[PDB]
């Protein structure tokens, strides 16, 4: 019935915020995700406005779309909070369309953030900064892994950056039918998501923490190329042939042998032999400390 659900959503007082406390703003992504101001999110501080992102359905959406948004909200409740993931902040579920209120990242996704900061052909990033960005993403993933969550689409596009340059993993709670994914469908930027997938996920559709580590390897490569496009110009069929032959991307120019070996370890052909996010956090912590910020 238009945008009204055939079913009705159960109340959850742990998370419910009155609709009139949410001042809706401009679109951020599509859909749909919109910037809003939330008044009195914290019940201790009722006079404060907090900038938040709000997920909601488009007028087109079906009961299945609603079901998927409810599922993401419920998984976010279960997973709990961490500094390096996008956290659930509240919901409006009653007497109107479902709003899922989550953290706002004012500097947008990591791919654009990195690209905007390439030297001109915007302040440049030091080696330490790039390695700290990798560190934070690995910490977010270590948390998610510890909570038994497999992301399935880890990539710079799904990492968001806050006003204080905190990296936050986004979209870890999405319901996806991996049988139905279009290998030829592209991101809005025109790149192919198959280029982040482990061979076992790609060929046999087996998704594991180990396949997420493969994706993290590609993400590391994205970071040290300042937002480079993996396997540029390569179509799906040729990607499959490259992976069956054991091809691996070349070492980026602005990158140490140790970090490249980390990337290659993430792309181990045998999944059991890849490092764990726990180990990656440990190795990256040591490297951050030993890497120069120039000065
Ligand atoms: C100066 N500035 C440049 C970066 N600018 C920007 C652009 C797009 C942006 N998207 C989000 C965002 C999400 N797309 C998002 C999601 F898809 C799921 C869950 C939470 C989310 N939180 C967000 O904050 N922030 C953005 C900032 C706008 C202004
Ligand atoms: Cl509906
Ligand atoms: Cl918590
Ligand atoms: Cl991308």
Numbering used by the authors: 457 to 486, 490 to 580, 592 to 765
What do the authors say?
Fibroblast growth factors and their receptors (FGFs and FGFRs) play a critical role in many physiological processes including embryogenesis, wound healing, inflammation and angiogenesis as well as adult tissue homeostasis. For the analyses of inhibitor sensitivity, we focused on a structurally well-defined kinase domain (KD) of FGFR1, with the gatekeeper V561M variant and Y563C variant (corresponding to the replacement found in FGFR4) generated in the context of FGFR1. To extend the structural analysis, we solved the structures of the WT FGFR1 KD without and with bound TKI258 and of FGFR1 KD V561M variant with TKI258 at 2.3, 1.96 and 1.96 Å resolution respectively.
The drug engages the enzyme with a total contact area of ~ 60 Å2. Five hydrogen bonds (involving residues E562, A564 and S565) and 10 amino acid residues involved in hydrophobic interactions provide a direct contact between WT FGFR1 and TKI258 and stabilises the drug–protein complex. One water molecule is found to interact with atom N29 of TKI258. When compared to type I FGFR1–3 selective inhibitors and type II inhibitor AP24534, TKI258 occupies a smaller region confined within the adenosine-binding pocket.
